[PDB]
């Protein structure tokens, strides 16, 4: 049981800690991250994200993000995926980034990647947008025009409410 840095993290320099966790990680960093998440205090929460974005370039396994999202994950997953949307072509990554941006309000950063990225299915995206009502949602009037799906957007707006959406 050499994994005991969860208590020493509050005193050791995070730089050399990340450097030690990046190297010599022969299927070992996963257990260390699981042990860190087992005692994920608010103080040592961001360090679990800092170490997480070093090994993804070599092996971006889904088990890690699945175990991470099992907790609350207010903005840790969003801050992690903020540097993963670029240099990536997977639609599920973008969908999980949209979910994280819907967990805590950062929707102003989603309307840009909807125009930039074009390697995702807009059907599930607009379904999730219509499901999670932001009560101030206007990325839809952008993605629908980008993918030419305003014929149902106008109907949905007229159904829910029509105050400023079509105007703006």
């Amino acid at each position: 049981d050499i994994k005991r840095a969860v208590v020493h993290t509050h005193l050791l320099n995070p730089e050399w800690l990340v450097n030690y966790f990046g190297s010599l990680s022969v299927e070992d960093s996963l257990e260390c991250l699981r042990a860190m998440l087992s005692a994920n205090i608010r103080q040592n929460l961001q360090i679990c994200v800092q170490v997480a974005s070093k090994y993804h370039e070599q092996l971006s396994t889904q088990s890690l993000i699945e175990l991470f999202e099992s907790f609350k994950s207010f903005e840790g997953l969003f801050y992690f995926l903020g540097s993963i949307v670029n240099f990536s072509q997977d639609p599920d990554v973008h969908f999980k980034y949209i979910q994280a941006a819907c967990k805590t309000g950062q929707i102003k950063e989603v309307e840009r990647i909807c125009r930039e990225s074009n390697c995702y299915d807009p059907e599930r995206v607009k379904n999730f947008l219509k499901e999670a009502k932001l009560t101030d949602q206007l990325p839809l009037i952008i993605v629908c025009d980008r993918f030419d799906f305003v014929h149902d957007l106008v109907l949905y707006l007229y159904r829910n409410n029509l105050q400023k959406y079509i105007e703006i």
């Binding site: 903005e75 967990k103 805590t104 309000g105």
Partner: protein, 38 residues
């Protein structure tokens, strides 16, 4: 009659629970701290 009064009190407690759910739904607004992006 007293049990119906207690049911009304339980409905008031459910309204308080709905208020707590609204507070939880508003919590993501406070969760969006700009200092967490550093």
């Amino acid at each position: 009659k007293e049990y119906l009064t207690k049911v009304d009190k339980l409905d008031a407690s459910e309204s308080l629970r709905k208020e707590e759910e609204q507070a939880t739904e508003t919590q993501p607004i406070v969760y969006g701290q700009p200092q967490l992006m550093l």
